[PDB]
Amino acid sequence: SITESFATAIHGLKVGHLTDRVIQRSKRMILDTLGAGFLGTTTEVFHIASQYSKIYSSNISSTVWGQPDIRLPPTYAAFVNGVAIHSMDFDDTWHPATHPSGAVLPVLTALAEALPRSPKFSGLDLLLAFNVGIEVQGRLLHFAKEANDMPKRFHPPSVVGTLGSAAAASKFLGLSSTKCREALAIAVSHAGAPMANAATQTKPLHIGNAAKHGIEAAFLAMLGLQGNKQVLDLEAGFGAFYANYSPKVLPSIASYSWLLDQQDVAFKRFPAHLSTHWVADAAASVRKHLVAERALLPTDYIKRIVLRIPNVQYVNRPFPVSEHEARHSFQYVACAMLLDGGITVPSFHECQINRPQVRELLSKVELEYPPDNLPSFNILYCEISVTLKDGATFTDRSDTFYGHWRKPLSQEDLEEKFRANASKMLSWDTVESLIKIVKNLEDLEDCSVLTTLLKGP
Amino acid sequence: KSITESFATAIHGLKVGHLTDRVIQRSKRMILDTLGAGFLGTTTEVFHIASQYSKIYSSNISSTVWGQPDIRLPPTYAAFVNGVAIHSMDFDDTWHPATHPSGAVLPVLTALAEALPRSPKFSGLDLLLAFNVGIEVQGRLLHFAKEANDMPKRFHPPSVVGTLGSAAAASKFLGLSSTKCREALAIAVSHAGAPMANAATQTKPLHIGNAAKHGIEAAFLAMLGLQGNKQVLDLEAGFGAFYANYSPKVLPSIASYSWLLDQQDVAFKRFPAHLSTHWVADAAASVRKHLVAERALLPTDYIKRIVLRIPNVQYVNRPFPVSEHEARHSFQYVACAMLLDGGITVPSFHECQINRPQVRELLSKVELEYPPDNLPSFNILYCEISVTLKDGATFTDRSDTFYGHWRKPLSQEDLEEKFRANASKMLSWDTVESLIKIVKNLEDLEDCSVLTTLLKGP
Ligand code: NA
Ligand code: NA
Ligand code: NA
Ligand code: NA
Ligand code: NA
Ligand code: NA
């Protein structure tokens, strides 16, 4: 069965199955995700998630990133750190479309701190469990062509991320293939959040809950709870989250091939929906024609701004107000880039989003939907056309952006993003120590060195 | 106003004065039946697993695990474990459109009432109001699709509407503003929705346990200021994601409010199995009496063919169940156990009983037929059974309504006797009788601590 093929691989994959490339790519993902989390601990949604979670205590506990004072049961530590990771839509993005690392990394750091292993949990053990969690998500996404395109009904992290967390937790716990299977079945009953709460303050909890519920499923499987033995094979099981469900068995452990070895992740340079990174790139490029040697946008002289984009309705927001809406707005990212010449973390403060000059530009934006601009991160582009009041029009088309898997961030730029994100809450020495540890994570003998640094300062 | 706003307005705005005599009468029955299901459910392995998992969580506030004075949990986890107990044996109440409404709501309110004592005290009438708001919200959400009138095909309804009913009941207990009631619903939507495949497995009871737990979590997060989509119930890509054909409608105004429970009663089960098998058991019980009257039951080996004419409900089509959970979801096993044993009782679903060779011999003779008029709705469906013997004689019987269905509801006496049988496994007779009396007069109770103190046992 398909379900059995997943359980067999989760249990059976070994450190020796890792490739150099999958280790290199997952180390980049781990660093980027830690940075997103640390920056996320400054957000209101993180404060709410932590205030809720703090009602719970346990003799078996792990720590919230950067917050030595907040010790939580590992399920709730993973919840809060996951909320932080996804709080600003700054975390990594894959193809088919999901945010994979945020569902997996805080699970494994929580469990490593809360539950000593024998032998002790090593950097390679972490990389193995992490890559199993990533791999399971990607294989589940490939169960339907529709997961290649932007989601219409369920938010993918809540669907595949929940099972990825369960798989990573099952790997950490050393569960038998039978108990790995049960963990997946139990996780299915915790999976699946609708798309409506995207672009609201609740969206980050989709990743926090994926992390939390995956651990809960693994724990319950460990204790002996049973679920449907064919849960991934059934239209009324995991297929309930898909419009057209086409599942397939995994490859055999013999000469296993990782999806991450043939599909890199995208890393964001600013905290917003990935589709808007194409918009930002094109708007930055067209701006050169408008400002000449003056460095100033001729705002009053612009007649019309046309964005030729894929039809992605949850990112079509002509007048966003909240930070969450602006992160999901083709239009705001275009106009802020034209006006400001860049997009940064403060671009999504409410006081920037509602600037009168921004709203003047937003009043001039029209969307067009070219038929070949399909709503997939592997296909889509943005073409922007700016028409001036004298009738002159300048056009710029971006089919990728720096940080996309087609143009991946350098190690240097990835580390500089991490430094910017983490220095809000950690000291310089801790930031540099984390860079060095993660860069050489396969050499780390004891993960407690990593989890101790994550407490700060 | 939006559909979502109309729900928040009603949750916040409904008052004890809006309750009718009939909704109080029917909900008092639901509360007693659900307590009994829970008490009996504390004997099950799934409850013990849920309890062992939950015991790792401590909090400064705590509530009781029913019948377990040795176990106190944060109210979220108490509602979780008691909800698992309620649904652990598929013995809890069933509504139209199809769901199990009380299990998602009662353990929420008993947990919160004990963990967060109020002044003025939380009265029986306050409990009845918050309970009936939770029930009402579920019913209105079920009516957002014609398909909820029929058996589910993709998502298990308790996980969908139960989660929001819990959120509503918790929001009512906590006295949240209408705005925060709205946010609680929106947050709850992101916690809702479990697929059907885990029905007939040991995980199904967690659908009700999680509905209870996640509704409280949503209300707590709303109380802390978390915000979600303001039109979550209006949107195809919000709550509509769980429905094939979504057709939401505003609630009526509170100034002229009518409760769904006033025009649609619940069904109470007589044995712990899927409601659709209660028609099968009823029909098989009668055909058995006919066979015995003609001296044609024994030997069981002279039965050649057993035809069940039933609705097309494939997750209850299980010709050779082996586990307890499969047998509770098997037309075939319920028919065969009734024919062999002459009744269906709690031990009928122990695996030793399920896997008796005589049972397997009867199961191998069963065939299902699907009459087109036997629609998969608890309002419509029936069971016809035909037993043919080796000598050719055919005995046919039929059940259009079984005792316990809303059309033929359990008398108060029989409902109380079911409670006694279920609750006496964990409670002393004095406590059992005290709970019957308290619930029967719940509108007169000044302080719900009198009720929650008894729930600890013995
Ligand atoms: Na979807
Ligand atoms: Na499907
Ligand atoms: Na145009
Ligand atoms: Na769900
Ligand atoms: Na729908
Ligand atoms: Na009859």
UniProtKB/Swiss-Prot annotation, chain A:
Upper taxonomic classification of the species? Eukaryota, Metazoa, Chordata, Craniata, Vertebrata
Assembly notes = Homodimer.
Task: State how changing H99A affects the protein, per the record.
Answer: Abolished cis-aconitate decarboxylase activity
GO MF annotations for this entry? Answer: aconitate decarboxylase activity; protein homodimerization activity
Q: Where in the cell is it found?
A: Mitochondrion
Please identify the protein, giving its name as recorded: Cis-aconitate decarboxylase
- Activity dependence on pH, as recorded: Optimum pH is 7.0.
Q: Which species expresses this protein natively?
A: Homo sapiens
Q: How the protein is affected by changing H155Q?
A: Strongly reduced cis-aconitate decarboxylase activity; reduced protein stability
Q: What does this protein do?
A: Cis-aconitate decarboxylase that catalyzes production of itaconate and is involved in the inhibition of the inflammatory response. Acts as a negative regulator of the Toll-like receptors (TLRs)-mediated inflammatory innate response by stimulating the tumor necrosis factor alpha-induced protein TNFAIP3 expression via reactive oxygen species (ROS) in LPS-tolerized macrophages.
